Nucleic acid binder design. Structure first.
Lengths: 63, 336
RNA sequence: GGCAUUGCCGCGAAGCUACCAUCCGCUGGAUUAUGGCUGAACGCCUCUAAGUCAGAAUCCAUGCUAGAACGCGGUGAUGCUCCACACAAAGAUGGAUACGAAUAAGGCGUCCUUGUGGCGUCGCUGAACCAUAGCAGGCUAGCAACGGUGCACUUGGCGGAAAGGCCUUGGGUGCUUGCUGGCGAAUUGCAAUGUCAGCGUGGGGAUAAAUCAUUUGUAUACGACUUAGAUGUACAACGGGGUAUUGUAAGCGCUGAGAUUAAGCCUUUGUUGUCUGAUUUG
């Protein structure tokens, strides 16, 4: 969408930061990413390698 | 059988009609959205093709095909259609202010007994200082989201002479209707060949009514619809060595020795296509191009001929050209 | 040649057939379980309560088949003229009087920078608004004012969703109730509305057709449908010819020669011949 700031994070390998204003939208497209990764048909825990949302929080800090 | 086709009875029309059109695009040239042929003759062609991964890849192949006689067609008039929350609706038919004989003949079921007074008001009145189509055509300019154009054949230029020429319309895929309407306005009293219309490796459709047999519901004589027919060879009616391939390189008229079965030769271009083109023979058929973007490895391919069948297929097809035919015969009884 | 119920072996165009030949056979939505986003209810949460993002061999669109025989649009032709004779030269009586959007809100005027602004105010009925006097609306005198209004000429523009509607410009023509005049009305006798919504006939003349009929074949049981029929590549036939079926013909090797060949093959520099009847409609 619009209103999403995307970045492939540097200082951490294997992670990506998406931020913005609307809770609805940032977690909207975050949920939309974790559900394009669905692994069915197979062993569930076979690869716990997957796509997750590691951090939930604000930009500022100290606000 | 299928309940797709209901109810049972005959196709009320000798010429079928066109029930779809490719959507449109505003950024294109003004394009002729479809065209109609005449299927004349069946035949068989050998060739080879490029199909990577298929078991016929780079491998000489043989299949029957269909030929369709295609006169280059002449255009008279334009009608724009307003859109209304019922359906479309016409505004006014326009014409070329000179019409050929045959399209005049479309307006009389009895031609000889008639007075040939048909157009004098309309076609004569346009002869003037102008304004004849001005008001109406500019009205099309203002209104009329979609635009179609009158098209009609020259059947004196076909070896089957009924003297009477069919009418049809075809849309225009251009945009900004000005260069649509002006387009054909420029094309009034003109013809438009098949050059800019289609080219090879393009899937299209040609369909029509099918082979009336008789009554035992009534079997046949329906206009069915068979899409996905790959044109192998886009003919040209002035092309010497009609069947000249990427291989053969010898002179043959696609019309065989002694002629086609129930035909004289071919005066205008043609389309050879694989498979079947519905109907019985001598037929007028409809051609609609893809209705959409089909692009894929399947449709992006390129045809490579080997040999086209010019043999005379009445009885067992044997020779090809009368020069080679007369070299193998040698002298007959009275010959030489 | 004929019978041998289409004479058998063999050949067979063509017609008609064969998963016994070949082609070809739709692309997007809305969805359920499911996984969730957001966030109460519930000071924890939660896919849910409001709102939500994906998604089915489904439903609907996309594409295909027909096309209302009391569904409709476009344009091509002329319906016109004469005489005789018939209507007229499912419910009216002031006016169908136009933003749009919300309704836990909006108009209107106004302020200023232009606002998701300030100020005022309105609504709580159309019971409103315009129009309205004159014999069913006469005939006549002026006072003011350059109005309002009719009608016909008329400019200009807009309206194609069924536009056929609206505004507008310019003169004349009439009206005037904005104001004050003068003559008329009965007897319809005390109610029984008591008024004020060019047109087909039938027979001529002519215009353009259409039909039957005739021919053809893409059609076909009848129907029905597709061609041609006005002096031309028109048509029809012979022959010139071209393919191809056919397997060597009466008869003195001659001879893959013969016979047939569109009647559901073809091109026809030539030959011969045809070219307009009846019926109705507008």
């Amino acid at each position: 969408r619009d209103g999403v700031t995307i970045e492939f994070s540097t200082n951490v390998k294997d992670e990506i930061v998406l931020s913005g204003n609307s809770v609805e939208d940032v977690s909207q497209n975050a949920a939309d990413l974790q559900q394009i990764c669905r692994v069915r048909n197979k062993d569930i825990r076979k690869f716990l390698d997957g796509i997750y949302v590691s951090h939930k929080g604000f930009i500022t800090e100290d606000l | 059988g299928h309940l797709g086709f209901l109810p049972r009875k005959r196709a009320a029309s000798i010429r079928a009609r066109v029930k779809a059109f490719p959507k449109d695009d505003r950024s294109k040239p003004v394009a002729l959205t479809s065209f109609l042929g005449y299927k004349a003759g069946m035949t068989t062609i050998v060739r080879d093709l490029d199909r990577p991964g298929s078991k016929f890849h780079k491998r000489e192949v043989v299949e029957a095909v269909t030929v369709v006689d295609t006169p280059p067609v002449v255009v008279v008039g334009v009608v724009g259609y307003v859109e209304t929350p019922r359906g479309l609706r016409s505004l006014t038919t326009v014409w070329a202010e000179h019409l050929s004989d045959e399209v005049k003949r479309r307006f009389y079921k009895n031609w000889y007994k008639s007075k040939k007074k048909a157009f004098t008001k309309y076609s004569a009145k346009y002869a003037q200082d102008g304004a004849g189509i001005e008001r109406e055509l500019a009205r099309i300019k203002k209104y009329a989201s979609v635009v179609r154009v009158l098209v009609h054949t020259q059947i004196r230029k076909t070896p089957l002479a009924q003297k009477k020429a069919h009418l049809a319309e075809i849309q225009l895929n251009g945009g900004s209707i000005s260069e649509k309407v002006d387009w054909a306005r420029e094309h009034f009293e003109k013809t438009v060949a098949v050059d800019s219309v289609f080219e090879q490796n393009e899937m299209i459709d040609a369909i029509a009514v099918t082979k009336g047999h008789g009554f035992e519901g009534q079997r046949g004589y329906h206009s069915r619809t068979s899409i996905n027919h790959k044109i192998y060879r886009v003919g040209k009616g002035d092309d010497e060595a009609n069947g000249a391939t990427s291989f053969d390189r010898t002179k043959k008229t696609i019309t065989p020795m002694g002629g086609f079965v129930h035909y004289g030769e071919i005066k205008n271009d043609f389309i050879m296509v694989k498979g079947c083109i519905p109907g019985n023979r001598k037929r007028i058929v409809t051609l609609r191009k893809s209705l959409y973007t089909n692009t894929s490895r399947k449709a992006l391919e390129e045809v490579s001929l080997k040999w086209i069948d010019t043999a005379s297929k009445f009885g067992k097809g044997r020779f090809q050209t009368p020069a080679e035919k007369h070299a193998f015969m040698g002298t007959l009884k009275k010959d030489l």
